Amino acid sequence: NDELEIIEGMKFDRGYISPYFINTSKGQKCEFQDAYVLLSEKKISSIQSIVPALEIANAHRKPLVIIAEDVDGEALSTLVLNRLKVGLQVV
Amino acid sequence: GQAFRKFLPLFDRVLVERSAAETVTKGGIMLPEKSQGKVLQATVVAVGSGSKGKGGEIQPVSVKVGDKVLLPEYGGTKVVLDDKDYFLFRDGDILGKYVD
Amino acid sequence: GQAFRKFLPLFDRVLVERSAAETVTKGGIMLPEKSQGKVLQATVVAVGSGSKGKGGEIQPVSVKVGDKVLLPEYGGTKVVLDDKDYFLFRDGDILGKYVD
Amino acid sequence: GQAFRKFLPLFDRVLVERSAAETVTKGGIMLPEKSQGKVLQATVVAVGSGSKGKGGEIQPVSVKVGDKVLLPEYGGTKVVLDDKDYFLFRDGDILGKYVD
Amino acid sequence: GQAFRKFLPLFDRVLVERSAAETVTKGGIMLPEKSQGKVLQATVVAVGSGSKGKGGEIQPVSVKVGDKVLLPEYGGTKVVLDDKDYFLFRDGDILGKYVD
């Protein structure tokens, strides 16, 4: 049968970089409410460029979604480590 | 000269111990163990007897055991005492000294 | 020697602070923050005790804290004190001194 | 030492000013501004205090302000005073001196 | 100078013997004979007469036969005495000395 699907909001067809950020088992989704959004035009590589955003997010106890050109090894390692060992809400 | 764990530097060499690297920022952000690299803060644990590079009588080393020093980022010789790592520099290589 | 923020240079090393770079021309034209590069104007913040390169007794450093100096464009060691950046040179590397 | 525009060379350094390049030949032929290159005629504008390379007491610089000198073609450090360009050499680098 | 097996070092050279490498860990694990490489623990077996690098009268060597020393990882000259291997260093190359 034919179907009609309505897509609302802003859907841009890009997935999570690492499976470690998933926090919802049913459906394999990373879901957050009242999240900060960090928009980066250029690639994020170094730990200095990424740590301040994590500090700001953790100070206010809010999740953080980082939309960027790409995330490199050092920053990604910091993100996954903090998410796994602290429960930091990041994606 | 002043010995340390039965080891005595020769001439103007100084044996120092590097401080522990930071693992958590001033906030709550923890750091990967591969990102700290090398730290330039050290404490002097052993001192040699005197400088052979001085003409005539040899001069004493300019630092004393227990001082906190700022090291260069390129020098140092690795030694192991009681399975702990210490670094041997020349008295002229130490960049600076901290005071309290 | 004269200390600064609990840091003391050794021998004939001099610790200096670089001046702030220009951001607006003498007119109203502002400059990109990537174009200023490095400035060769500095102020002396700390001085060592004396030169080890002099035979016999060591000689005092030729500059005093507070002087304004013209630095070379290739030397200098980076140090951090209270999260601010300072540069460590040798007393013989300083190109010139300004007077008022 | 003798200062110039509030600038004083250190040790045995000499600050000199290059002469203006020729723009018209002895006849009526004018020369492109890209062809003159660099001129080796200079006038001494500032002199340092003394040579650190001499053992014992430091010796005075061998030239005085106002002399006309023949410089080498490979050395010199560029400095700017009141937006005018001056060149800093070592006292031993100056090739020759002119007399009247 | 003190001889050893009818061999006498010249000037400030020191002849030392390397210690035997570990073959079994502190537990029961044995190690391949190709993995130990080179050991930096040595015992002094012969000492020279004095340093030719000192101006004027020559100075005696700073170590005595029987001392245990920590050697550098890059120097040393190979010699054979009674089919056993010994290593010849300069008195200034020895990194450190052990005491009991």
Short mmCIF file of C-alpha atoms in Angstrom, two decimals:
data_model
loop_
_atom_site.label_atom_id
_atom_site.label_comp_id
_atom_site.label_asym_id
_atom_site.label_seq_id
_atom_site.Cartn_x
_atom_site.Cartn_y
_atom_site.Cartn_z
CA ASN A 1 0.00 0.00 0.00
CA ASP A 2 0.93 3.64 -0.47
CA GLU A 3 2.12 5.69 2.50
CA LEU A 4 2.49 9.36 3.39
CA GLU A 5 5.33 10.42 5.70
CA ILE A 6 5.70 13.93 7.12
CA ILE A 7 9.18 14.98 8.26
CA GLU A 8 9.22 17.98 10.60
CA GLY A 9 12.00 19.93 12.26
CA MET A 10 15.49 19.71 10.78
CA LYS A 11 16.52 16.23 9.63
CA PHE A 12 19.84 16.16 7.76
CA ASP A 13 20.72 12.44 7.57
CA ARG A 14 23.92 12.11 9.60
CA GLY A 15 24.44 9.41 12.21
CA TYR A 16 26.29 9.21 15.50
CA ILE A 17 30.05 8.85 15.13
CA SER A 18 30.55 6.24 17.87
CA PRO A 19 28.20 3.53 19.20
CA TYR A 20 29.36 4.45 22.72
CA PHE A 21 27.05 7.50 22.79
CA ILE A 22 23.85 5.41 22.65
CA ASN A 23 21.75 5.68 25.81
CA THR A 24 18.45 4.07 24.69
CA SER A 25 18.43 0.30 24.22
CA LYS A 26 15.06 -0.04 22.45
CA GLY A 27 15.73 1.22 18.93
CA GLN A 28 19.46 1.90 19.43
CA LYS A 29 19.05 5.66 19.75
CA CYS A 30 20.79 8.55 21.47
CA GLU A 31 18.00 10.72 22.89
CA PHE A 32 18.33 13.95 24.87
CA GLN A 33 16.04 16.68 26.18
CA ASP A 34 16.93 20.35 26.68
CA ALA A 35 20.35 19.95 25.09
CA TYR A 36 23.05 22.46 24.24
CA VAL A 37 24.12 22.54 20.60
CA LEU A 38 27.71 23.30 19.59
CA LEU A 39 28.06 24.17 15.90
CA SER A 40 31.58 23.99 14.45
CA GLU A 41 32.30 24.95 10.85
CA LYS A 42 35.81 23.45 10.98
CA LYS A 43 37.09 20.10 12.20
CA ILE A 44 37.67 19.58 15.92
CA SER A 45 41.00 17.89 16.63
CA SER A 46 42.73 19.14 19.77
CA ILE A 47 41.70 18.64 23.39
CA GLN A 48 41.90 22.43 24.17
CA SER A 49 39.37 23.30 21.63
CA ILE A 50 36.88 20.75 23.00
CA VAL A 51 37.40 20.84 26.78
CA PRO A 52 35.80 24.29 27.38
CA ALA A 53 32.48 23.21 25.84
CA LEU A 54 32.40 20.09 28.01
CA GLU A 55 33.17 22.19 31.08
CA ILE A 56 30.36 24.62 30.24
CA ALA A 57 27.90 21.77 29.67
CA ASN A 58 28.87 19.94 32.87
CA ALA A 59 28.68 23.11 34.97
CA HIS A 60 24.98 23.52 34.12
CA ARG A 61 24.16 19.78 34.07
CA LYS A 62 22.87 19.63 30.50
CA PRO A 63 23.50 17.32 27.53
CA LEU A 64 25.59 18.45 24.57
CA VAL A 65 25.30 17.70 20.86
CA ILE A 66 28.34 18.67 18.78
CA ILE A 67 27.63 19.16 15.07
CA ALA A 68 30.97 19.59 13.34
CA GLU A 69 32.87 18.97 10.12
CA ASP A 70 34.49 16.01 11.90
CA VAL A 71 35.82 14.88 15.28
CA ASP A 72 39.39 13.59 15.49
CA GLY A 73 41.11 10.97 17.62
CA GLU A 74 42.04 13.01 20.69
CA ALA A 75 38.72 14.83 21.13
CA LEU A 76 36.75 11.68 20.30
CA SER A 77 38.77 9.72 22.86
CA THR A 78 38.06 12.37 25.50
CA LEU A 79 34.34 12.32 24.65
CA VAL A 80 33.99 8.53 24.75
CA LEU A 81 36.05 8.26 27.94
CA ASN A 82 33.98 10.89 29.75
CA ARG A 83 30.72 9.39 28.48
CA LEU A 84 31.66 5.87 29.61
CA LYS A 85 33.30 6.63 32.99
CA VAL A 86 31.31 9.66 34.15
CA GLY A 87 27.94 9.36 32.44
CA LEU A 88 28.54 12.69 30.70
CA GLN A 89 25.65 13.29 28.30
CA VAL A 90 27.34 14.04 24.98
CA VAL A 91 26.98 13.08 21.33
CA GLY B 1 77.62 14.53 46.80
CA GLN B 2 74.29 13.32 48.20
CA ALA B 3 73.21 9.77 47.39
CA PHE B 4 69.70 8.46 46.74
CA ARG B 5 68.64 4.81 46.96
CA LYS B 6 72.34 3.85 46.90
CA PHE B 7 72.95 5.83 43.68
CA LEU B 8 75.33 8.79 43.40
CA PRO B 9 75.60 11.06 40.33
CA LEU B 10 79.08 11.84 39.04
CA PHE B 11 80.53 15.30 38.42
CA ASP B 12 77.81 17.93 37.84
CA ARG B 13 74.90 15.61 37.03
CA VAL B 14 71.59 16.04 38.86
CA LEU B 15 69.02 13.27 39.34
CA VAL B 16 65.41 14.47 39.47
CA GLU B 17 61.92 12.98 39.70
CA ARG B 18 59.11 14.13 37.42
CA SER B 19 55.80 15.19 38.93
CA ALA B 20 52.58 13.31 38.25
CA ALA B 21 50.56 14.41 35.24
CA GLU B 22 47.10 15.92 35.50
CA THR B 23 44.24 13.47 34.98
CA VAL B 24 41.22 15.72 35.67
CA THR B 25 40.85 19.35 34.63
CA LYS B 26 39.98 22.07 37.13
CA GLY B 27 36.37 21.05 36.44
CA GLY B 28 35.08 17.51 36.10
CA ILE B 29 36.58 16.61 32.71
CA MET B 30 38.96 13.65 32.76
CA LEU B 31 41.85 13.45 30.30
CA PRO B 32 43.08 10.47 28.23
CA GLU B 33 46.25 8.87 29.57
CA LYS B 34 47.86 9.26 26.13
CA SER B 35 47.40 13.06 25.95
CA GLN B 36 49.48 14.34 28.89
CA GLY B 37 52.82 13.64 27.21
CA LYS B 38 55.71 14.83 29.37
CA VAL B 39 55.78 17.27 32.29
CA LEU B 40 58.58 19.77 32.88
CA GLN B 41 58.12 20.07 36.66
CA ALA B 42 60.61 18.06 38.69
CA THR B 43 62.09 17.65 42.17
CA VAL B 44 65.81 17.16 42.76
CA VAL B 45 66.58 13.84 44.44
CA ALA B 46 70.37 13.57 44.01
CA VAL B 47 73.26 15.93 43.26
CA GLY B 48 76.78 15.32 41.99
CA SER B 49 80.07 16.39 43.52
CA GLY B 50 81.22 19.21 41.22
CA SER B 51 81.70 20.42 37.66
CA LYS B 52 84.57 19.03 35.60
CA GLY B 53 84.01 21.73 32.96
CA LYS B 54 85.42 24.49 35.17
CA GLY B 55 89.11 25.20 34.77
CA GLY B 56 91.13 24.60 37.90
CA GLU B 57 89.20 23.55 40.98
CA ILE B 58 85.76 22.05 40.35
CA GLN B 59 82.72 24.12 41.36
CA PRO B 60 79.74 22.78 43.35
CA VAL B 61 76.36 22.14 41.77
CA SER B 62 74.02 25.13 41.87
CA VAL B 63 70.94 23.22 43.10
CA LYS B 64 70.31 21.21 46.27
CA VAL B 65 68.24 18.10 46.90
CA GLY B 66 64.59 18.93 47.52
CA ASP B 67 64.37 21.94 45.20
CA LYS B 68 61.62 22.14 42.59
CA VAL B 69 62.92 22.84 39.09
CA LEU B 70 61.73 23.56 35.57
CA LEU B 71 63.50 21.18 33.12
CA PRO B 72 64.12 21.44 29.38
CA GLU B 73 61.86 19.56 26.98
CA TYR B 74 64.61 17.77 25.02
CA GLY B 75 67.26 16.47 27.44
CA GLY B 76 67.50 13.88 30.20
CA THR B 77 68.75 10.31 30.69
CA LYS B 78 66.42 7.58 31.94
CA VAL B 79 67.38 5.57 35.03
CA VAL B 80 65.45 3.04 37.12
CA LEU B 81 65.75 2.87 40.92
CA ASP B 82 63.56 0.42 42.85
CA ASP B 83 61.50 0.08 39.64
CA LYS B 84 60.70 3.82 39.67
CA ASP B 85 61.80 6.14 36.87
CA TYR B 86 64.21 9.04 37.48
CA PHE B 87 65.90 11.41 35.05
CA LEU B 88 69.52 12.55 34.98
CA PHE B 89 70.39 16.00 33.63
CA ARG B 90 73.43 18.25 33.60
CA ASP B 91 73.53 21.12 36.08
CA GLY B 92 73.60 23.60 33.19
CA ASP B 93 70.53 22.13 31.48
CA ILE B 94 68.04 22.96 34.24
CA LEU B 95 65.97 25.89 32.98
CA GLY B 96 64.74 27.34 36.26
CA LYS B 97 64.01 26.99 39.96
CA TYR B 98 60.83 27.57 41.98
CA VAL B 99 60.77 29.22 45.41
CA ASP B 100 58.23 29.33 48.23
CA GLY C 1 68.71 37.09 41.31
CA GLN C 2 65.21 38.59 41.31
CA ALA C 3 62.25 36.21 41.37
CA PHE C 4 58.89 36.60 39.64
CA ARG C 5 55.71 34.72 40.59
CA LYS C 6 57.88 32.30 42.61
CA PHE C 7 60.12 31.56 39.60
CA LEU C 8 63.85 32.31 39.46
CA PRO C 9 66.00 32.02 36.30
CA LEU C 10 69.32 30.21 36.62
CA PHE C 11 72.72 31.56 35.59
CA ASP C 12 72.47 34.30 32.94
CA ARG C 13 68.93 33.61 31.72
CA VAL C 14 66.43 36.48 31.51
CA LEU C 15 62.65 36.06 31.66
CA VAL C 16 60.69 38.64 29.65
CA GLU C 17 57.08 39.38 28.72
CA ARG C 18 56.07 40.19 25.15
CA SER C 19 54.03 43.31 24.46
CA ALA C 20 50.51 43.15 23.05
CA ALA C 21 50.19 43.16 19.27
CA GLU C 22 48.52 45.96 17.34
CA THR C 23 44.88 45.32 16.42
CA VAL C 24 43.96 48.66 14.79
CA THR C 25 46.18 50.73 12.52
CA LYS C 26 46.87 54.40 13.21
CA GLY C 27 43.62 55.00 11.30
CA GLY C 28 40.43 52.99 11.66
CA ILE C 29 41.52 49.78 9.91
CA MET C 30 41.40 46.67 12.09
CA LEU C 31 43.82 43.80 11.51
CA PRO C 32 43.16 40.03 11.43
CA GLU C 33 44.30 38.21 14.56
CA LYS C 34 46.30 35.79 12.38
CA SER C 35 48.43 38.51 10.71
CA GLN C 36 50.34 40.06 13.63
CA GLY C 37 52.66 37.08 14.07
CA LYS C 38 55.25 37.75 16.77
CA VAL C 39 56.41 41.03 18.33
CA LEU C 40 60.02 41.76 19.26
CA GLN C 41 59.26 44.30 22.01
CA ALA C 42 59.52 42.90 25.53
CA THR C 43 59.81 43.87 29.19
CA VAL C 44 62.19 42.13 31.58
CA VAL C 45 60.36 40.44 34.45
CA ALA C 46 63.10 38.25 35.98
CA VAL C 47 66.90 38.09 35.90
CA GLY C 48 69.36 35.32 36.73
CA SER C 49 72.27 35.37 39.14
CA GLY C 50 75.31 35.47 36.84
CA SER C 51 77.01 34.09 33.76
CA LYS C 52 78.60 30.64 33.90
CA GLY C 53 80.34 31.27 30.56
CA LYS C 54 82.81 33.74 32.07
CA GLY C 55 86.10 32.28 33.23
CA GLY C 56 86.73 32.67 36.93
CA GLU C 57 84.11 34.58 38.88
CA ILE C 58 80.68 34.81 37.28
CA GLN C 59 79.57 38.22 35.96
CA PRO C 60 76.16 39.80 36.64
CA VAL C 61 73.46 40.05 34.00
CA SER C 62 73.61 43.25 31.95
CA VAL C 63 69.87 44.07 32.17
CA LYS C 64 67.61 44.76 35.14
CA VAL C 65 63.96 43.96 35.76
CA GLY C 66 61.66 46.59 34.27
CA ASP C 67 63.79 47.44 31.24
CA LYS C 68 62.27 47.40 27.76
CA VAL C 69 64.25 45.31 25.28
CA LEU C 70 64.38 44.39 21.61
CA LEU C 71 64.57 40.56 21.28
CA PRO C 72 65.80 38.35 18.43
CA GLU C 73 63.29 36.78 16.07
CA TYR C 74 64.50 33.17 16.39
CA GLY C 75 65.27 32.41 20.05
CA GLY C 76 63.35 32.06 23.30
CA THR C 77 61.92 29.31 25.51
CA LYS C 78 58.22 29.24 26.38
CA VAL C 79 57.15 29.14 30.04
CA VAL C 80 53.75 29.48 31.71
CA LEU C 81 53.26 31.35 35.00
CA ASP C 82 49.74 31.78 36.39
CA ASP C 83 48.49 30.72 32.93
CA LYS C 84 50.29 33.66 31.29
CA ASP C 85 53.05 33.17 28.73
CA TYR C 86 56.61 34.37 29.35
CA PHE C 87 59.79 33.84 27.34
CA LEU C 88 63.25 32.88 28.59
CA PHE C 89 66.33 34.09 26.71
CA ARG C 90 70.06 34.19 27.33
CA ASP C 91 71.58 37.49 28.40
CA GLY C 92 73.69 37.54 25.23
CA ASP C 93 70.72 37.00 22.91
CA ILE C 94 68.94 40.29 23.70
CA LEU C 95 69.47 42.55 20.69
CA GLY C 96 68.96 45.96 22.28
CA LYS C 97 67.60 48.13 25.06
CA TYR C 98 65.26 51.14 25.02
CA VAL C 99 65.73 54.22 27.20
CA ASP C 100 63.45 57.06 28.27
CA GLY D 1 77.40 53.60 24.87
CA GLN D 2 75.74 56.26 22.71
CA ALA D 3 71.99 56.06 22.20
CA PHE D 4 69.98 56.92 19.08
CA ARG D 5 66.25 57.65 19.01
CA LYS D 6 66.00 56.12 22.51
CA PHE D 7 67.68 52.87 21.36
CA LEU D 8 70.99 51.57 22.74
CA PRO D 9 72.91 48.60 21.28
CA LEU D 10 74.19 45.99 23.72
CA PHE D 11 77.76 44.74 24.01
CA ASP D 12 79.76 45.25 20.79
CA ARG D 13 76.86 45.75 18.37
CA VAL D 14 76.86 48.76 16.04
CA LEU D 15 73.73 50.32 14.53
CA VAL D 16 74.24 51.88 11.10
CA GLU D 17 72.15 53.55 8.39
CA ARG D 18 72.49 52.58 4.73
CA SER D 19 73.07 55.28 2.14
CA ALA D 20 70.55 56.02 -0.60
CA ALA D 21 70.92 54.07 -3.83
CA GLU D 22 71.77 55.68 -7.15
CA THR D 23 68.78 56.43 -9.38
CA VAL D 24 70.49 58.23 -12.29
CA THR D 25 73.85 57.34 -13.82
CA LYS D 26 76.61 59.91 -14.20
CA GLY D 27 74.87 60.77 -17.48
CA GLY D 28 71.13 61.08 -17.99
CA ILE D 29 70.16 57.40 -17.79
CA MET D 30 67.72 56.55 -15.00
CA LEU D 31 67.79 53.12 -13.34
CA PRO D 32 64.89 50.81 -12.41
CA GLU D 33 64.07 50.79 -8.71
CA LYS D 34 64.37 46.98 -8.70
CA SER D 35 67.97 46.91 -10.01
CA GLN D 36 69.94 48.71 -7.27
CA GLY D 37 69.70 45.83 -4.79
CA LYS D 38 71.64 46.60 -1.62
CA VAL D 39 74.36 49.17 -0.94
CA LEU D 40 77.40 48.51 1.26
CA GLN D 41 78.02 52.14 2.26
CA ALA D 42 76.75 53.03 5.72
CA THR D 43 77.02 55.61 8.49
CA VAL D 44 77.30 54.65 12.16
CA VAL D 45 74.39 55.95 14.22
CA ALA D 46 74.79 54.03 17.50
CA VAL D 47 77.55 52.11 19.28
CA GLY D 48 77.48 49.52 22.06
CA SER D 49 79.31 49.55 25.37
CA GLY D 50 82.02 46.92 24.89
CA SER D 51 82.89 43.45 23.65
CA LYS D 52 81.85 40.42 25.71
CA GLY D 53 84.09 38.17 23.59
CA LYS D 54 87.29 39.55 25.12
CA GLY D 55 88.63 37.66 28.11
CA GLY D 56 88.78 39.71 31.27
CA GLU D 57 87.72 43.33 30.98
CA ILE D 58 85.55 44.20 27.99
CA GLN D 59 87.12 46.31 25.22
CA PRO D 60 85.47 49.37 23.63
CA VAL D 61 84.03 49.32 20.13
CA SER D 62 86.52 50.29 17.43
CA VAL D 63 84.21 52.72 15.57
CA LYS D 64 82.48 55.91 16.69
CA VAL D 65 79.13 57.42 15.76
CA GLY D 66 79.33 59.45 12.56
CA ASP D 67 81.96 57.34 10.80
CA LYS D 68 81.35 56.08 7.27
CA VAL D 69 81.89 52.33 6.90
CA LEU D 70 81.98 49.59 4.30
CA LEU D 71 79.71 46.69 5.44
CA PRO D 72 79.67 43.01 4.47
CA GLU D 73 77.15 41.79 1.91
CA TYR D 74 75.70 38.93 3.99
CA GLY D 75 75.20 40.09 7.59
CA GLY D 76 73.02 42.58 9.45
CA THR D 77 69.83 42.61 11.53
CA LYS D 78 66.87 44.77 10.53
CA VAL D 79 65.42 47.25 13.04
CA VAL D 80 62.83 50.01 12.69
CA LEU D 81 63.14 53.36 14.48
CA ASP D 82 60.55 56.08 13.81
CA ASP D 83 59.47 54.00 10.78
CA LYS D 84 62.98 54.25 9.27
CA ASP D 85 65.14 51.19 8.65
CA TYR D 86 68.48 50.69 10.41
CA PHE D 87 70.85 47.72 10.46
CA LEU D 88 72.63 46.15 13.42
CA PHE D 89 76.01 44.48 12.92
CA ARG D 90 78.78 43.16 15.14
CA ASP D 91 81.87 45.31 15.58
CA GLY D 92 83.98 42.58 13.97
CA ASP D 93 81.78 42.30 10.87
CA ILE D 94 82.44 45.82 9.55
CA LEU D 95 84.76 45.44 6.57
CA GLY D 96 86.32 48.90 6.45
CA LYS D 97 86.24 52.58 7.32
CA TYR D 98 86.43 55.70 5.15
CA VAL D 99 88.42 58.82 6.08
CA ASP D 100 88.36 62.42 4.90
CA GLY E 1 97.40 2.92 37.22
CA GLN E 2 96.12 -0.53 38.21
CA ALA E 3 96.60 -3.38 35.73
CA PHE E 4 94.26 -6.30 35.03
CA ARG E 5 95.28 -9.55 33.33
CA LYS E 6 98.48 -7.81 32.16
CA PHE E 7 96.50 -4.95 30.55
CA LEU E 8 96.78 -1.30 31.60
CA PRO E 9 94.48 1.49 30.33
CA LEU E 10 96.12 4.70 29.17
CA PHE E 11 95.29 8.21 30.37
CA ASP E 12 91.76 8.47 31.81
CA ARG E 13 90.28 5.29 30.31
CA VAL E 14 88.45 2.83 32.56
CA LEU E 15 88.05 -0.88 31.82
CA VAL E 16 84.84 -2.42 33.17
CA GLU E 17 83.03 -5.76 33.08
CA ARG E 18 79.32 -5.99 32.31
CA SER E 19 77.04 -7.92 34.66
CA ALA E 20 75.19 -11.04 33.57
CA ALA E 21 71.75 -10.54 32.06
CA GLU E 22 68.57 -11.82 33.67
CA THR E 23 67.32 -15.16 32.32
CA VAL E 24 64.34 -15.79 34.63
CA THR E 25 61.87 -13.18 35.87
CA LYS E 26 61.12 -12.75 39.57
CA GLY E 27 58.57 -15.52 39.01
CA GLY E 28 59.10 -18.66 36.96
CA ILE E 29 59.06 -17.14 33.46
CA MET E 30 62.24 -17.65 31.46
CA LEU E 31 63.35 -15.08 28.88
CA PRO E 32 64.69 -15.62 25.34
CA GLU E 33 68.45 -15.14 25.03
CA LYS E 34 67.86 -12.65 22.19
CA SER E 35 65.66 -10.28 24.25
CA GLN E 36 67.99 -9.08 27.03
CA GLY E 37 70.04 -6.84 24.74
CA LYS E 38 72.66 -4.92 26.70
CA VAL E 39 72.95 -4.21 30.43
CA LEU E 40 74.16 -0.90 31.87
CA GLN E 41 75.44 -2.30 35.18
CA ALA E 42 79.20 -2.78 35.31
CA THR E 43 82.12 -3.31 37.67
CA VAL E 44 85.42 -1.47 37.28
CA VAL E 45 88.34 -3.83 36.67
CA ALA E 46 91.10 -1.43 35.57
CA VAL E 47 91.82 2.30 35.82
CA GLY E 48 94.15 4.59 33.88
CA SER E 49 96.83 6.90 35.20
CA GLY E 50 95.30 10.36 34.73
CA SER E 51 93.43 12.73 32.44
CA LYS E 52 95.26 14.33 29.52
CA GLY E 53 92.34 16.74 28.98
CA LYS E 54 93.15 18.76 32.10
CA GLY E 55 95.40 21.76 31.59
CA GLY E 56 98.66 21.57 33.47
CA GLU E 57 99.14 18.54 35.69
CA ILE E 58 96.97 15.53 34.89
CA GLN E 59 94.19 14.64 37.36
CA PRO E 60 93.52 11.13 38.69
CA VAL E 61 90.55 9.06 37.59
CA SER E 62 87.44 9.57 39.72
CA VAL E 63 86.60 5.85 40.14
CA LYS E 64 88.55 2.98 41.69
CA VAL E 65 88.75 -0.69 40.79
CA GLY E 66 85.91 -2.68 42.35
CA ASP E 67 83.26 0.04 42.17
CA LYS E 68 79.87 -0.69 40.60
CA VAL E 69 78.88 1.83 37.94
CA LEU E 70 76.00 2.78 35.67
CA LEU E 71 77.30 3.13 32.07
CA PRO E 72 75.89 5.00 29.07
CA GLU E 73 73.95 3.10 26.43
CA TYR E 74 75.93 4.31 23.39
CA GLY E 75 79.65 4.29 24.22
CA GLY E 76 82.34 1.72 24.97
CA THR E 77 85.17 -0.09 23.17
CA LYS E 78 85.28 -3.89 23.03
CA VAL E 79 88.39 -5.72 24.26
CA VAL E 80 89.11 -9.41 24.85
CA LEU E 81 91.19 -10.65 27.79
CA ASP E 82 91.59 -14.40 28.34
CA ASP E 83 88.71 -14.84 25.87
CA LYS E 84 86.37 -12.80 28.11
CA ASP E 85 84.81 -9.54 26.96
CA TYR E 86 85.54 -6.23 28.70
CA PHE E 87 84.56 -2.68 27.79
CA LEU E 88 86.72 0.45 27.78
CA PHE E 89 85.12 3.84 28.48
CA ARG E 90 86.34 7.33 29.24
CA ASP E 91 86.24 8.51 32.84
CA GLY E 92 83.78 11.25 31.87
CA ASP E 93 81.36 8.87 30.14
CA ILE E 94 80.39 6.88 33.26
CA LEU E 95 76.88 7.99 34.20
CA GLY E 96 76.82 7.06 37.88
CA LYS E 97 78.17 5.07 40.80
CA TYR E 98 76.47 2.73 43.27
CA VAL E 99 77.25 2.63 47.00
CA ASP E 100 76.62 0.10 49.75
#
